[PDB]
Amino acid sequence: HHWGYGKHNGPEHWHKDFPIAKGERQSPVDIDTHTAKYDPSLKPLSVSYDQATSLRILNNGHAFNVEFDDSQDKAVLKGGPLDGTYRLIQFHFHWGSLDGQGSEHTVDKKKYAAELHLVHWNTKYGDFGKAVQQPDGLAVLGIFLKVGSAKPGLQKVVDVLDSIKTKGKSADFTNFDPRGLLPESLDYWTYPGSLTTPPLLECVTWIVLKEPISVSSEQVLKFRKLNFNGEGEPEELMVDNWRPAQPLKNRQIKASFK
Ligand SMILES: NS(=O)(=O)c1ccc(NC(=S)OCCc2ccsc2)cc1
Ligand SMILES: [Zn+2]
C-alpha cells in the first residue's frame, strides 16, 4: 500500500506516512500575483545548460524522469534567490487527465495543463542525498505548460515514451538538450517550499517561471498514455499525478519582475 495519486493512496493520505505533509513550508502553493512582491534583492537568474549530459529516461511509477550525469559541474542554476551553484540532476512533469488541470502550482488559482520540474541540488552539500538533509539543499525550476502550438524541443521526450510505458522501465536517453524546454522569459516567482511528492522534504527553493511553454494536444496526449502500473498489471493511466496547492503559512512569494 504505497503512496500514489488514487483515492486510497493520494495526497490526502500522504500525511500518515509522511507527517511533514502538514508542515510549515509545503509545496506546491497558489501564487497570488497581486500579493507577490517584486524583490530588488534578487540577483539575475542564470540557467546554464549548454553542457548538460542526459543519460536515461525512467518511468518510476509516479512520473518519468529524464536523468542527467551530475558528476561534474555542467548544467547549473545560479543567481536569483540562490546562494551558490545548483546542479541539474533530473527533470520530470506533472500533468492532468484533461487540459484544464495538471499543474501543481497555480497562478491566481489557475491550473495549467502540466508543469515541468527541473531539479537541482546545491553543490555545497556534495550529493543529492546530503542536499535533502538541508533547508537550502535543492532548487526546482518550475515551468507551466499550456496546450497550443507544439514545443519542438519536447518531441524527442514524447517519442521515447512508448519504450517506457510501465513502471520500472527505462531507456537510454543521451544528448537531450533541456534548453529546448524553456520559454523566452526568465521572469519568475520564488518562495521556500518542499518536494511535492513523498518524502515531501522541506529543502526546496522554488523558482516558478511566469511564462508558460506551449505544447500540442498531441504531445500531452502521449504523456497520458503512460501507465502508473507495471508491465502485465492492470492498466491505470498515468494522469493527474499532481499534488494540489498547500497552505502558504508564514511565507511570502517574491517576484523577479516589476
Ligand atoms: N516534484 S518535485 O520536483 O518537488 C520532486 C523532486 C525530487 C524528488 N525526489 C526525488 S527522490 O528525485 C530523485 C531524482 C533522481 C535520483 C537519481 S537520478 C534521478 C521528489 C519530488
Ligand atoms: Zn515535480
As a three-state string, the secondary structure of 78-120 is EECCCCCCEEEEEEEEEECCCCCCCCCCEECCECCCEEEEEEE
Q: 195, 203 in Cβ contact below 8 A? A: yes
What is the spatial distance between Cα 119 and Cα 61, in angstroms, rounded to a whole number?
18
- Resolution expressed in Å: 0.9
Four-CA torsion 180, 61, 87, 111, nearest 10 degrees: 60
Residue to probe by mutation, ligand 1, list 86, 119, 164, 242, most atoms within 8 Å of CB: 119
Which cell goes with 138? 535543492
Residue 232: partners with Cβ closer than 8 Å, 6 or more residues away: none
Question: Which ligand sits closest to the CA of 198?
Answer: 1
Using CA positions, which residue lies closest to atom 13 of ligand 1?
Answer: 90
Using CA positions, which residue lies closest to atom 6 of ligand 1?
Answer: 195
Residue 190: partners with Cβ closer than 8 Å, 6 or more residues away: 39, 42, 80, 81, 205, 206, 207, 208, 253, 254, 256
Cα 159 to Cα 177, 221, 222, 228, distances in angstroms? 15, 12, 9, 18
Identify how the structure was determined.
X-ray
What is the CA 37 to chain-centroid distance, rounded? 23
Using CA positions, which residue lies closest to atom 5 of ligand 1?
Answer: 195
Residue 73: partners with Cβ closer than 8 Å, 6 or more residues away: 85, 87, 123
Residue 256 Cβ inside 6 Å of ligand 1? The answer reads no
Quickly list DSSP for 14-77: GGGT-GGGGSSS-S--EE-TTT-EE-TTPPPEEEE-TT--EEEEEE-SSSEEEEE--SSS-SEE
What is the spatial distance between Cα 131 and Cα 138, in angstroms, rounded to a whole number?
7
Strands 30-31 and 106-107: parallel
Residues 57, 63, 69: CA angle, nearest 5 degrees: 35
Which residues are annotated as catalytic? 62
What is the spatial distance between Cα 54 and Cα 70, in angstroms, rounded to a whole number?
9
Cis peptide before 199 (omega within 30 of 0): yes
Q: 118, 95 in Cβ contact below 8 A? A: no
The structural architecture, per CATH, of the domain 1-258 is: Roll (3.10)
> Hunting for cell 544528448 — which residue is that?
175
Q: Which of 106, 138, 136 is nearest to 119 (CA)?
A: 138
β-sheet bridge partners, residue 140: 119, 206
Amino acid at 25: R
Cα 82 to Cα 44, 104, 129, 216, distances in angstroms? 10, 22, 19, 33
What is the spatial distance between Cα 223 and Cα 244, in angstroms, rounded to a whole number?
19
Q: 91, 145 in Cβ contact below 8 A? A: no
CA of 185 to the centre of ligand 2 (A): 21
Which cell goes with 69? 550525469
Domain boundary assignment for the chain = 1-258
